[PDB]
């Protein structure tokens, strides 16, 4: 089975494994690294999306929108302080 | 083109399938994904160079993420990475 499905991961391990070469980050890359990277990428996006889903749901909207993302991002201090210099286009204060 | 929106849709359906997403929000997610990726990768590279290493491994990224990431998110993500690579390698 594919490397992602072997890991159970929902991201293109092959792309990122390629990208690790394509970005010159190192002339060698070890097989777990793109897998480990994909795992944390999935985890990170899940955490934000969960909060943003609550934000849309709380606003009675099915559509997740920048407002709902921004509201989520600023409500978690960790995400907010992690993302303190990220600016959300059409994300209101 | 080389974009994650399909993977965003996967995890979106996996996390809140009751929610749609604006293309704007989807693009923001793509920008977000690229930002965090280049942040962790650029760090791990410079750490590897500091360690005089021509290769990047799980330890480098596992260290880099613990450097970048807030303390809870770090150990949670670290555990997720170690679990995932354990499944991958045990397979």
């Amino acid at each position: 089975k594919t490397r992602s499905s072997r890991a159970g991961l929902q991201f293109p391990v092959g792309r990122v494994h390629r990208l690790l070469r394509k970005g010159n980050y190192a002339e060698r890359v070890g097989a777990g690294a793109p897998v480990y990277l994909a795992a944390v990428l999935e985890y990170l996006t899940a955490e934000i999306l969960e909060l943003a889903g609550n934000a849309a749901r709380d606003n009675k909207k099915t559509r997740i929108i920048p407002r709902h993302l921004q509201l989520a991002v600023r409500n978690d201090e960790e995400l907010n302080k992690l993302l303190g210099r990220v600016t959300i286009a059409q994300g209101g204060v | 083109k080389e974009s994650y929106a399909i993977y965003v849709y996967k995890v979106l359906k996996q996390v809140h399938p009751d929610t749609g997403i604006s293309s704007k929000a989807m693009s923001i997610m793509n920008s977000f994904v690229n930002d965090v990726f280049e942040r962790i990768a650029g760090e791990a590279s410079r750490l590897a160079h500091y360690n005089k290493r021509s290769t990047i491994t799980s330890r480098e990224i596992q260290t880099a993420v613990r450097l970048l990431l807030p303390g809870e998110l770090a150990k949670h993500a670290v555990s997720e990475g170690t679990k995932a690579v354990t499944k991958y390698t045990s397979a």
């Binding site: 955490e47 409500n75 978690d76 | -």
Partner: peptide, 14 residues
Amino acid sequence: TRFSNRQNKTVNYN
């Protein structure tokens, strides 16, 4: 199904 590991403050966004 993509469960979240962190235990965090509950929020009302409405």
